[PDB]
Amino acid sequence: VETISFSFSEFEPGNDNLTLQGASLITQSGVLQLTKINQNGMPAWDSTGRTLYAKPVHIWDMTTGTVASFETRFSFSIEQPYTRPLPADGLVFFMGPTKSKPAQGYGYLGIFNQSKQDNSYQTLGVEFDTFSNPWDPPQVPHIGIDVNSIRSIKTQPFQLDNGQVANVVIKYDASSKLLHAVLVYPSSGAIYTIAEIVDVKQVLPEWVDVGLSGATGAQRDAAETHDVYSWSFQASLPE
């Protein structure tokens, strides 16, 4: 059974277990800022940042056909400081091909290049989308399950509690092929849930890099923060 596990209760500047890409940065206070915050302390527009765990994870084995069960938990906050233009774009927890670089930002969230459903993406993502693009449902923010496309196969609207910490739990049970995610805001006590069937063998490569990506908007000040406070992950391949 090969297992891989990690827990960052806080982020350490300079640690070598995380690959930071784009605007991503760890502050001296221990928080991971996925998108840029300016000198005056406000979120910068046109920013994309990602953080990938530095070891690939063996998610399924073609020789035996077994696939791993996994769980990830993370805490984040989004602060939207201006009434207009509308804030944008959101953050995503994703799994895809190893050694990837950032793709398009804005509504593609640093992981897709257009809005087609293309099997060559080989990407699974759980988004927290704050801007309604032509491919989105009208309600934002929303949690969405993305399978080889920014056009989610399932969406769940949620209300943002501005600048408050949200706790996320995403679990995948390989036997039932069920991906279930929960978002809880301790401040208001709000609980949101989403679940869909996803057979990972049809989507992902055998080895994947796991990460978080965030992006701000395409026009001046269409921005918000995408701060992450802790992140843990565990995966077990019955092999």
Ligand X SMILES: OC[C@H]1O[C@@H](O[C@H]2[C@H](O)[C@@H](O)[C@H](O)O[C@@H]2CO)[C@H](O)[C@@H](O)[C@H]1O
Return residues touching ligand X (CB under 6 A): 85, 88-89, 106-107, 131, 133, 217-219, 222
- Under the criterion CB under 8 A, does residue 64 sit at the interface with a copy of itself? no
**Which residue from 22, 125, 144, 211 is in contact with Mn ion, where contact means CB under 5 A?**
144
Map tokens 């593609």 to a residue.
108
In whole angstroms, how close is the CB of 149 to Mn ion at the nearest point? 10
2, two tokens: 């090969």
Q: Nearest CA to 179 among 98, 59, 55?
A: 59
**Which residue from 27, 139, 193, 219 is in contact with a copy of itself, where contact means CB under 8 A?**
193
In whole angstroms, how close is the CB of 148 to a copy of itself at the nearest point? 18
- Under the criterion CB under 8 A, does residue 138 sit at the interface with a copy of itself? no
85 touches, from a copy of itself, ligand X, Ca ion, none (C-beta below 5 to 8 Å by class) = ligand X
- Under the criterion CB under 8 A, does residue 164 sit at the interface with a copy of itself? no
- Given CA atoms 20, 25, 28, 30 in this order, what sign does their dihedral have? negative
Bridge partners of residue 236, in order along the sequence: 3, 69
- Under the criterion CB under 5 A, does residue 104 sit at the interface with Ca ion? no
Single out the segment in contact with a copy of itself by CB under 8 A; choices: 44-52, 173-181, 216-224, 230-238.
173-181
By CB atoms closer than 10 A (0-12, 13-18, 19+), residue 44 is middle
Q: Nearest CA to 78 among 184, 190, 161?
A: 161
- Given CA atoms 107, 108, 114, 117 in this order, what sign does their dihedral have? negative
Map tokens 């057979």 to a residue.
199
Task: Determine contact, residues 185/175, Cβ cutoff 8 Å.
Answer: no
Q: Using CB under 8 A, list all residues that contact a copy of itself.
A: 73, 167, 169, 171, 173, 176, 178, 180, 182, 184, 186, 189, 191, 193, 195-197
Q: Using CB under 5 A, list all residues that contact Ca ion.
A: 107, 129, 131, 133, 136
Q: Using CB under 5 A, list all residues that contact Mn ion.
A: 129, 136, 144
